[PDB]
Amino acid sequence: GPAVGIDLGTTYSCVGVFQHGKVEIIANDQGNRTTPSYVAFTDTERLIGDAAKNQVAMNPTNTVFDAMRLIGRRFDDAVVQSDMKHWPFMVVNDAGRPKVQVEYKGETKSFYPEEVSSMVLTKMKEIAEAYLGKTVTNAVVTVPAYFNDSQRQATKDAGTIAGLNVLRIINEPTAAAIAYGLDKKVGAERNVLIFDLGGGTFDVSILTIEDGIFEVKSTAGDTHLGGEDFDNRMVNHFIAEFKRKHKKDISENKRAVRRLRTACERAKRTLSSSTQASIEIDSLYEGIDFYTSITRARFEELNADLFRGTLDPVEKALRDAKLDKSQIHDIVLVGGSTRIPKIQKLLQDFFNGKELNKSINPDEAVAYGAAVQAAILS
Numbered sequence: 001g002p003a004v005g006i007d008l009g010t011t012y013s014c015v016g017v018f019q020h021g022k023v024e025i026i027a028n029d030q031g032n033r034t035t036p037s038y039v040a041f042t043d044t045e046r047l048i049g050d051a052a053k054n055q056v057a058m059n060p061t062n063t064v065f066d067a068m069r070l071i072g073r074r075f076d077d078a079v080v081q082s083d084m085k086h087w088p089f090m091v092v093n094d095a096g097r098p099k100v101q102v103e104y105k106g107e108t109k110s111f112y113p114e115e116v117s118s119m120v121l122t123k124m125k126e127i128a129e130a131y132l133g134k135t136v137t138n139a140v141v142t143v144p145a146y147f148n149d150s151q152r153q154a155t156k157d158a159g160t161i162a163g164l165n166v167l168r169i170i171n172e173p174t175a176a177a178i179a180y181g182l183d184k185k186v187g188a189e190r191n192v193l194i195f196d197l198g199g200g201t202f203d204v205s206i207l208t209i210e211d212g213i214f215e216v217k218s219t220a221g222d223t224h225l226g227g228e229d230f231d232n233r234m235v236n237h238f239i240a241e242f243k244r245k246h247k248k249d250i251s252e253n254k255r256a257v258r259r260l261r262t263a264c265e266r267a268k269r270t271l272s273s274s275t276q277a278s279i280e281i282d283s284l285y286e287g288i289d290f291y292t293s294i295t296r297a298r299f300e301e302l303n304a305d306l307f308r309g310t311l312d313p314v315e316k317a318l319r320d321a322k323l324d325k326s327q328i329h330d331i332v333l334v335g336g337s338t339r340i341p342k343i344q345k346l347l348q349d350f351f352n353g354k355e356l357n358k359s360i361n362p363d364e365a366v367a368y369g370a371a372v373q374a375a376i377l378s
């Protein structure tokens with residue numbers, strides 16, 4: 001190709017390419033190494049990635065996200081029915097199949113989950129092409145380890161629709177292990193634990209690797225736990241603060257809440273490197289500027305229960321894998337949320353000081369491994 005590795009996530013997507021014995025995680029037009037998994041439809045255009053997310057506040061009904069939560073599923077699915085209740089966009093039934101319904105250029109249109117994902121995949125393909133200066137065709141696409149045949153098929157289809165020849169569909173935890181070279185033959189089998197805390201989901205996977213062959217020993221987690229939940233906690237904290245300081249409730253102003261949310265997410269990232277962060281929003285509500293700050297300690301307390309809760313799925317995974325903590329040879333951090341110091345502390349303490357594999361940007365690890373695997377399969 002070269003062939004590329006693509007990681008489609010609920011909040012962000014990432015693409016990498018293995019060249020000259022080195023994986024390059026490709027930055028997009030905005031210089032971002034991961035692209036928001038958003039698609040938007042307006043009176044005049046279809047927006048994808050950064051352009052789409054950067055307007056979600058003003059176009060909630062026609063800005064689609066979470067397509068992978070529907071991909072390969074039936075409309076009658078309990079999870080699909082549950083999820084629909086929280087989405088600002090419409091999901092309709094088409095002969096037992098879910099389709100997202102939106103308005104584009106004044107007309108009603110509907111798309112199968114794979115079509116929405118193909119739009120994001122197309123963006124990742126173009127990002128790779130802009131970088132490589134050559135057409136990208138072959139690719140390795142990743143999916144959560146628990147995805148079934150239908151979900152894998154629909155994910156492959158999204159790739160094909162995007163003009164990609166999907167060389168293989170591989171598990172996200174496996175891709176992460178590959179990124180760290182944990183697939184190399186070392187004689188005996190090894191037990192690896194993947195701790196993936198993304199934007200919308202939390203996955204714990206225990207793999208047993210031997211002779212370059214992976215076995216998913218167990219999987220655990222929470223499909224509704226991620227960085228967005230941490231943002232929500234901060235948002236509520238600041239809504240209350242604004243109310244105290246201005247006796248005005250901004251909760252019903254969907255846009256004001258979004259500008260705050262974005263400020264919070266940004267502040268959250270800053271808190272992973274520094275112990276404090278400043279939030280400055282000009283004319284947040286009724287021309288009132290909102291300048292404030294939050295400490296890492298405060299951020300940790302606001303999310304204490306959620307953070308500590310990540311250890312339960314870890315224990316369950318070990319239990320289902322029939323292994324003790326001591327039997328885990330490697331712990332791999334995946335997902336942007338694993339950059340939070342308190343999360344790393346919790347996991348390391350649980351593992352009695354065992355070092356964590358965290359040198360590869362957690363939100364890029366899956367794409368990294370997929371790129372290596374794509375090169376191998378090419």
Ligand SMILES: Nc1ncnc2c1ncn2[C@@H]1O[C@H](COP(=O)(O)OP(=O)(O)OP(=O)(O)O)[C@@H](O)[C@H]1O
Pocket residue numbers: 008009010011012013034197198199200201202226227228265268269270272334335336337338339340362363364
């Ligand atoms: N430095 C950081 N500190 C804390 N959180 C961070 C940091 N960088 C990114 N994040 C958070 O990581 C999340 C994105 O992670 P990632 O790109 O792994 O998600 P994803 O693959 O889309 O999620 P999922 O696999 O759950 O669908 C966002 O919630 C983002 O706020």
Ligand SMILES: [Cl-]
Pocket residue numbers: 028029030049127
């Ligand atoms: Cl871009």
Ligand SMILES: [Cl-]
Pocket residue numbers: 345346
């Ligand atoms: Cl602690």
Ligand SMILES: [K+]
Pocket residue numbers: 007008009010012013014363
């Ligand atoms: K991702």
Ligand SMILES: [K+]
Pocket residue numbers: 196197198199201202203335
């Ligand atoms: K995840």
Ligand SMILES: [K+]
Pocket residue numbers: 144201202203223
């Ligand atoms: K997941």
Ligand SMILES: [Mg+2]
Pocket residue numbers: 008009010198199335366
């Ligand atoms: Mg992910």
